[PDB]
A paper describes a structure:
Hydrogen sulfide (H2S) plays roles in many physiological processes in mammals, including relaxation of vascular smooth muscles, regulation of inflammation, and inhibition of insulin signaling. More recently, it has been proposed that sulfane sulfurs, i.e., sulfur atoms with oxidation state 0 or −1, existing in the form of polysulfides (H2Sn), glutathione persulfide (GSSH), glutathione trisulfide (GSSSG), cysteine persulfide (CysSSH) and so on, actually mediate some of the reported biological activities previously thought to be regulated by H2S67891011. We determined the crystal structures of the m3MST complexes with 1 and 3 at high resolution. The most remarkable feature is that C248 is persulfurated in both crystal structures.
Interestingly, 1–3 all have a similar structural scaffold, i.e., an aromatic ring-carbonyl-S-pyrimidone structure. Persulfurated C248 appears to interact with the 4-pyrimidone-like aromatic ring of both compounds. To our knowledge, this interaction is novel in terms of both the long distance (>3.45 Å) and the orientation of the persulfide bond (almost perpendicular to the aromatic ring of the inhibitors). Direct hydrogen bonding by R188 and S250 and water-mediated hydrogen bonding by E195 and R197 are commonly observed with compounds 1 and 3. In addition, compound 1 forms water-mediated hydrogen bonds with D63 and H74. Both compounds were in van der Waals contact with W36, L38, P39, D73, H74, Y108, R188, P196, R197, G249, S250, V252 and V277. The thiophene ring (compound 1) and naphthalene ring (compound 3) exhibit cation-π interaction with R197 and parallel stacking interaction with the salt bridge between D73 and R19726. Gas-phase calculations indicated that the interaction of S–S− with pyrimidone is strongly exothermic (10.4 kcal/mol; CCSD(T)/aug-cc-pVDZ), which is not inconsistent with the experimental ITC measurements (ΔH = −9.37 and −11.76 kcal/mol for compounds 1 and 3, respectively). We concluded that the interaction is predominantly due to electrostatic attraction between the persulfur anion and the positively charged carbonyl carbon of the pyrimidone structure. Compound 1 showed about 25% inhibition of recombinant CBS and CSE enzymatic activities, while compound 3 was almost inactive towards CBS and CSE.
Residue numbers in the entry: 5 to 22, 27 to 296
């Protein structure tokens, strides 16, 4: 029914030695982490990989963060990294969590009509742990022909989130850390304060991942949604800070057989900026 979302390190390592495969490092870190993803790629990466810069695949005209680009922009960029319609794209990142920003890129390719895409389970962390082969040097690829076309069903807008406060057609699940959702930990963006969307439920993205940074099983993921009173038989929308880690909610749903979980791309940054005071639920004190 669905093209597989996960591939293993061992399957990738074997495939390297043997529908072309394109490995993409989509690492991206918030400034306060003090890490530079592209610099790290140049030092060490999976052999043959290219670096997918999520800042080259976003709408910089927006005041909000990590917003989808238009289809032409995406297509041009994917093609420049050597992706074609026949390609099996496998995305990874080098996060401490295992996967962090890579699931956004999996979701983006699918939203743009490219369904033969997967994530490297455990990311570069696991790859390194296993002492698998690595390469260095700046990113490069020959170009390929790529077309894209956005399926709007992959997205919810601010207007949709606001209407749903009353209509209650879909469940909203927020992948931010618990303290950000509750209002007790800061938002990384200056001018944005923490808290959550009324009626939403928190499943921090780390809840989908084991202690080794691998994805939990579909069985454990279904249990996790059920315990949080999230019903995979009803409509579900994923949100987070800027629409990136929300994709872990989409992924865990997809692995559970529910492949139609849109992302609220605007996410908390947009919600906060466009809010009236009643729209911010927080243990913290509302802005004066
Ligand atoms: N360039 C940026 O988006 C940026 C720079 C400083 S703060 C920031 N972005 C944000 O604070 C958006 S909220 C946010 N974005 C993320 C992006 C990638 C991965 C995780 C997150 C997150 O938890 N929250
Ligand atoms: Na976004
Ligand atoms: Na580079
Ligand atoms: Na802030």
């Amino acid at each position: 029914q669905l093209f597989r979302a996960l591939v293993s390190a061992q399957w990738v390592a074997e495939a390297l030695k043997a529908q072309p495969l394109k490995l993409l490092d989509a690492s991206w870190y918030l400034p306060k982490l003090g890490r530079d993803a592209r610099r790290e790629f140049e030092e060490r990466h999976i052999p043959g990989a290219a670096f997918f810069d999520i800042d080259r695949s976003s709408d910089h005209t927006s005041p909000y963060d990590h917003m989808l680009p238009n289809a032409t922009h995406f297509a041009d960029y994917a093609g420049s990294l050597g992706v074609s319609a026949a390609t099996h794209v496998v995305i990874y990142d080098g996060s401490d969590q295992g996967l962090y920003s890579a699931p956004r890129v999996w979701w983006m390719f699918r939203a743009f009509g490219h369904h033969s895409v997967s994530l490297l389970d455990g990311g570069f962390r696991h790859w390194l742990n296993q002492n698998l082969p690595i390469s260095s040097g700046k990113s490069h690829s020959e170009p390929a022909e790529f077309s894209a076309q956005l399926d709007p069903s992959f997205i919810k807008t601010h207007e949709d989130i606001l209407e749903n406060l009353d209509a209650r057609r879909f469940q909203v699940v927020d992948a931010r850390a618990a303290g950000r959702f509750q209002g007790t930990q800061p938002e990384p963006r200056d001018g944005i304060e923490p808290g959550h969307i009324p009626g939403s439920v928190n499943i921090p993205f780390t809840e989908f991942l084991t202690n080794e940074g691998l994805e939990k099983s579909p069985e454990e993921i279904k249990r996790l949604f059920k315990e949080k009173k999230v019903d995979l038989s009803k409509p579900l929308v994923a949100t987070c800070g800027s629409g990136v880690t929300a994709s872990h909610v989409v992924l865990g749903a997809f692995l559970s057989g529910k492949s139609d979980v849109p992302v609220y791309d605007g996410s908390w940054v947009e919600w906060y900026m466009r809010a009236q005071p009643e729209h911010i639920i927080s243990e913290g004190r509302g802005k004066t």
